[PDB]
Amino acid sequence: VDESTRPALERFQRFDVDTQLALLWYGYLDLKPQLNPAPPNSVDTPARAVFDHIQDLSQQEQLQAQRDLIKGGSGEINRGYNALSPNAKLEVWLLLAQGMENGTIIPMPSDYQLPNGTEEFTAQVKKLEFDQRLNFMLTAVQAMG
Ligand SMILES: CC1=C(/C=C/C(C)=C/C=C/C(C)=C/C=C/C=C(C)/C=C/C=C(C)/C=C/C2=C(C)C(=O)CCC2(C)C)C(C)(C)CCC1=O
């Protein structure tokens, strides 16, 4: 990330894990119109295998699996994610978001609201250029774990 994007990324990593997940969901909704949907052109993608392992879990454990991706760990799902390239890692998150929209991954609860104190960060992200937001995501997903 560049000089203008580093502060936003650093703030993001300082939120609690649940807040990070929610912000990633809201970020997806904001970016979605300008994103090409997953999967990529390759069929045997390693990202699909990691997503598929998460999809096969109960919804509650899908949530725990996504929490563990941000927190880090050495379990099977973390290891599958950690072996991926940064763009493949981002593919997993994109597949998860698409799964939330098609009903195969646990969705954002209708009663959830962000903890107080996210307004400044979301305002700052809204001011970033599209290229800066792409670099934010590539750097953020690689830094998880
Ligand atoms: C006939 C003939 C010829 C003709 C040659 C011709 C016709 C040449 C034409 C060549 C063309 C059309 C090349 C296109 C390349 C596209 C690239 C690299 C796209 C990258 C996209 C990216 C990174 C996307 C990224 C992204 C993704 C995916 C998103 O999902 C959203 C974000 C973002 C947009 C950033 C010659 C000239 C050779 C000789 C003369 C002659 O007779």
From TrEMBL:
<protein>
    <submittedName>
        <fullName>Orange carotenoid-binding protein</fullName>
    </submittedName>
</protein>
